[PDB]
Structure formats: C-alpha cells, structure tokens
Design a protein around this ligand. Structure first.
Ligand code: NAG
Ligand code: CA
Ligand code: CA
Lengths: 82, 196, 83
C-alpha cells in the first residue's frame, strides 16, 4: 500500500520504462510484462511453462482450441464463463 | 608497488584498490571496474550485476560479465559461461582450485570468485591510474576513490554508484537513514548482542 | 495487435503506420518507431557496446540525436552533469 517512486528493482523484479513504455521484468522467474501509453497489457513468458500456466491467457501449448481449461479443469465452449 | 585487490565483502560492500570500505546497496547492473576512462583505449570492461540485493539475504545471486579482447565470458549460478570467445585465447586460463575460480586474462589482470558472492579482481604495476569505476582509480591516493563518472569527488557513496550503473533508466537506490542497527536488529537489542 | 503478433513469430513488418492514419500514443518528443533497440543510448550514459545483444523491440523513441534525459528528448549539446 506504500506508493514508491519509479524505477524500482526489489526482489529480482526490475520495474523499468522502455521506449517510453513501462516494463516489469522477472527473468529469474521467467516473465516480462509491460504496458503502453493507451493501456495494453502484454506478457512475455519462457518455454519453461509449456503445458503449465493455466489461467486467463490459457496454457502454453501448441494447440489453440483446448486452451480453455478452467480452474477445475474443464474444456468449455464459452470464452466468457471461463 | 604491490598488486592491489578489490573485493565485495558480503552482499553490499566494496573494498577499493587503495583501500576504502564503503556501503552501496544496489539492484541494477554496475561497473565494478574498467579501462575506458576519459582518454584511453578501453581494453577491459569488467561489470557486476546484482538482483534482489538491497537487503542482504539468502537471495542476491550475482551476475558477472567481463568484456576483454572483444570477448564475452560471464558467470553465475556456480559455473562460468562463454558467450563470445576472445581472439587471443593464449592468455586465457581457468583454474577451478578449491572453493575458487581463479581466472587469468593477460599479463596484468586476474579475477577470483568464491562460487557464491566474492569478486576480487587483481591488477599489476602496469596501470597506475588507468582505470575507474566502483573500485576507484588505482593511484595510491585513497580519498579520490569516489570520483564519479561525471569527474568529481562525492561524499555519500550511495550517490557514487548510482552514477556507474549501466541501464540509465533502472532504479537508483534510496538514501537509507543511517543507524548502527539494520532492519531486523533495529529495535531488537537482544539479537544484536548474539550477533555482536 | 496484428503487427506485434506477426513480429513475435520471427517475421517483423515495417512502416505500416505511415499510411494507416493511426499512431499509438506516446508523450512529447517521441513518436512510434518500429524495432528500436531497448538499450537507448541516453545522456548520462557510459559509452559501452556489444553487451546489448537483446532482441529488437517496438516502441516510441527519440529522434536521431536528441538524447534522453528524465523522460524527455533533449539535444546532445545540452547534456548536464550531476552531483
Ligand atoms: C499436457 O499436460 C496434461 C496434464 O497436465 C497431460 O495430460 C498431457 O499429456 C500434456 N500434453 C500436452 C500436449 O499438453
Ligand atoms: Ca493454448
Ligand atoms: Ca584512489
């Protein structure tokens, strides 16, 4: 809850600005986030979680149809209740 | 004149050549020492990079990237790694004797690494004020080891190392309120005396 | 989005915003380049090279000169010092 300044680098999380756009790097933990001026979240993530990370950006598999596996684990046809 | 020796005692301290302990908790990547300083060729550019190391803990794995003879050999997580072999492989040498990684690079350069944190670069008579960086200038004069990149002496070393970081848009560290007790020992007088 | 999605796959595209009549927003002094290096040579910087072999990234950046200093582009002559 304490507002900090920027940039910021604690706990292996460099919180930087690149190309006038804000960045959050976690290369130890294998991810790089960022945002643009308008607001467009982006998430770069390694190959280490291939068939691991299940969530709202779906699994990191090859397929694209089966990447709605709910918090229970259920292939759903709706992109909404998921 | 004898062979001087930097060091990185613990997580966040630095011992210069002429001999000057000072405090610098950083988190960005920093220039430990180099030769490209003002009016010289710029042969070697040893760097150091820390991650999560403003408060010393079981964390703070270092990353060391050393740039000599157009090469790129670097080390972290126990082993060394070559990213770009340098031209004159003749002077190259690596001696994994005991705890250490002794590491020659020429007639007038050497490095040591205890596999965990310590960085102790060792120079010869050759330079005698040809370098700069965190470890200072290697001149014998001990109070001019705070000559920042903008060519002046500072007094508060937390502002010194902030000049020497590589990524000029990452975080400059925060001036801590000085006190003889760090975070945990602060207001925990009992524990302080078992460590003392 | 379609620009970046193709860029990530190993095949970049160029200059598409020239005629598209839409450029993504950025603060003053900069506009949207494409494939600028992340290691933007700024003003209070150490002249070091061939460590930033990172991949090339999209985003707005300064003109040819006009180095960066605290969130704005400023001409190389007026580089300050610090104490
Ligand atoms: C993925 O993981 C699941 C279980 O997590 C496993 O049943 C399956 O064989 C794996 N293969 C693919 C393509 O994800
Ligand atoms: Ca998928
Ligand atoms: Ca000195």
């Amino acid at each position: 809850d304490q507002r900090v300044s920027m940039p910021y680098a604690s706990k292996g999380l460099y919180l930087e600005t690149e190309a006038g756009y804000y960045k959050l790097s976690g290369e130890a933990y294998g991810f790089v986030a960022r945002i643009d001026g308008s607001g467009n979240f982006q998430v770069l993530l390694s190959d280490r979680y291939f068939n691991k990370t299940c969530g709202l950006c779906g699994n990191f598999n090859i397929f694209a149809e089966d990447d709605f596996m709910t918090q229970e684990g259920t292939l759903t046809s709706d992109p909404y209740d998921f | 004149v004898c062979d001087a020796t930097c060091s990185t005692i613990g997580m966040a301290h630095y011992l210069t050549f002429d001999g000057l302990k000072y405090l610098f908790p950083g988190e960005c990547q920093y220039v430990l020492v180099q030769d490209y300083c003002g009016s010289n060729p710029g042969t070697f550019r040893i760097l150091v990079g820390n991650k999560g190391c403003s408060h010393p803990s079981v964390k703070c794995k270092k990353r060391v990237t050393i740039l000599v003879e157009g090469g790129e050999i670097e080390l972290f997580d126990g082993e060394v790694n070559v990213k770009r072999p340098m031209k004159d492989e003749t002077h190259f040498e690596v001696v994994e004797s005991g705890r250490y990684i002794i590491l020659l690079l020429g007639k007038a350069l050497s490095v040591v690494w205890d596999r965990h944190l310590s960085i102790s670069v060792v120079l010869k008579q050759t330079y005698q004020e040809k370098v700069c960086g965190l470890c200072g200038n290697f001149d014998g004069i001990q109070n001019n080891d705070l000559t920042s990149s903008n060519l002046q002496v500072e007094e508060d070393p937390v502002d010194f190392g902030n000049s020497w970081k590589v990524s000029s848009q990452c975080a400059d560290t925060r001036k801590v309120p000085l006190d003889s007790s760090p975070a945990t020992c602060h207001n925990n007088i009992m524990k302080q005396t078992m460590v003392d | 989005e379609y620009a970046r999605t193709c860029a990530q796959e190993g095949m970049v595209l160029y200059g598409w915003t020239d005629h598209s009549a839409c450029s993504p927003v950025c603060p003053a002094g900069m506009e949207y380049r494409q494939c600028v290096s992340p290691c933007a040579r700024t003003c209070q910087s150490l002249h070091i090279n061939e460590m930033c072999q990172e991949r090339c990234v999209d985003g707005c950046s300064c003109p040819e000169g006009q180095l960066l200093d605290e969130g704005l582009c400023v001409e190389s002559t007026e580089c300050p010092c610090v104490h």
